[PDB]
Amino acid sequence: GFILAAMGSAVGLGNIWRFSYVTGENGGAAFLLVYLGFIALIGIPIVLAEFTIGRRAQSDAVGSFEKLAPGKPWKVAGLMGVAAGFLILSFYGVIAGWILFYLFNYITGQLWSAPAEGFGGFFEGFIANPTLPLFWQALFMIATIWIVAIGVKKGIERSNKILMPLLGVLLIALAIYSLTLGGAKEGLAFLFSPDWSALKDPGVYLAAISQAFFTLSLGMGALITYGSYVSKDSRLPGAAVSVAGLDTAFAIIAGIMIFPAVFALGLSPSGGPGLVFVVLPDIFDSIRLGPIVGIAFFILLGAAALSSAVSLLEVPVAYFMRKFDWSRKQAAITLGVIITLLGIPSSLSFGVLGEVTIIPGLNIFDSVDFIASSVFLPLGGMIIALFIGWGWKTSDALAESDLTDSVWGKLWILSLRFIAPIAILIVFLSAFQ
Ligand SMILES: CCCCCCC/C=C\CCCCCC(=O)OC[C@@H](O)CO
Ligand SMILES: CCCCCCC/C=C\CCCCCC(=O)OC[C@@H](O)CO
Ligand SMILES: CCCCCCC/C=C\CCCCCC(=O)OC[C@H](O)CO
Ligand SMILES: N[C@@H](Cc1c[nH]c2ccccc12)C(=O)O
Ligand code: NA
Ligand code: NA
């Protein structure tokens, strides 16, 4: 039921866009290994943790901590999630803006054939433009603010009820097609033959733990909100697995679509954020009716991004209504404008503001992404796990998580109580050296 809504949030640009350029510049299979290891040992338990919290509390993220734990400082994760909601959405609307621009050019037929400067140069010229991405960012943000304020979200999960299975099938089709382009052995080995020297590098673990929290909509309390509006019929840990498995499925299939085509096109896997925006247009170009494939793919991906951005904007909006007694439309608009303003310099980091560094060695886009995804999400996720692991009580924890008198229940508690917090902790200390 409402578990589909959680998948609507989980599956988005993190599965196709982010997963690609993070996996690419981090070795590939070695990264993927750690990534898959984190979803299992850290991801799924914490996803189940957020479901458990919301379902008992029957409230929003930050409100859940106060109801379950009045006055206790456990709510610092919820507050940290609010800040992450601002940061992540700020640049998320920028990448989603890129999708709408690419959608437009397939509608006008400008991307049907390769431009004079090539698809790479086309994307370069677009993001180097100071004001052209800003329009499409605003256009996407306005649509997000619109849906959140009006509260019309059944336009959204009737969408991910049809459009998301369509996205999955399309990706499966494109993944198979990409393997025929002549870079299959190079692509699969990159993705599934681990380089053990990369496991020497602590930064790989931090990138994997970041992608894990990002792709699962985890660490900021977005899933806590979904869990509150889940009836008690529903076995939560099956939901947590199904959510994690489906999202993992979307990402891995996307990798099989991208990287074989990357080596086929003779591109670098460490290309950057615009990797997919260079590969896909040429794949579609190799297809005779590829413009139609292109139009369909960016309509579907845009839908997935929209349903994820609504999920993102909801976290600060729901908070500001609980704390400052704002109306839904007021909160959505005000925060919407602020977040969009916050996204402008981030979008300019691909152009005239490329020289600016905030985090040492990282531009504005990478800095915001770092602070939100590599710091806030796993730190907040740690606190959430610690909350159930130590702050809760096993009897209540297992009761809500539908894992009473089970071996999985003890295994789940063990994850949240030690294995997950220590793993995130170890990654932190090793990375910050
Ligand atoms: C809703 C029904 C199923 C979905 C659509 C069915 C098509 C799925 C996969 C088709 C992939 C075709 C790949 C093979 C191919 O055409 O190779 C051509 C070759 O010349 C290109 O290098
Ligand atoms: C009922 C249909 C719904 C619309 C869904 C979107 C359509 C997806 C793909 C359109 C047709 C693709 C055909 C493949 C193709 O043109 O390959 C030919 C070329 O590569 C070889 O000569
Ligand atoms: C109907 C969408 C409204 C978007 C405009 C909101 C203004 C605030 C921030 C976005 C700034 C971008 C507007 C300028 C613009 O149209 O650029 C177009 C391209 O540069 C065309 O070459
Ligand atoms: N999971 C989504 C992005 C997302 C939506 N809500 C979130 C909350 C927290 C972290 C990430 C998200 C994606 O992969 O595209
Ligand atoms: Na995802
Ligand atoms: Na989505």
TrEMBL record:
The keyword Plastid is assigned to this record: no
InterPro entries named among the record's database cross-references: Na/ntran_symport, SNS_sf, YocR/YhdH-like
Protein name from the UniProt record: Sodium-dependent transporter
SUPFAM superfamilies, sorted: SNF-like
UniProt KW keywords: Membrane, Transmembrane, Transmembrane helix, Transport
A GO CC annotation given for this chain: membrane
Any Pfam family the entry gives: SNF
Record's bilayer topology term: Multi-pass membrane protein
Source superkingdom: Bacteria
Annotated localization: Membrane
Parts of the chain that traverse the membrane: 1-17, 29-49, 76-104, 134-152, 164-184, 204-226, 238-267, 287-320, 332-350, 370-390, 411-433
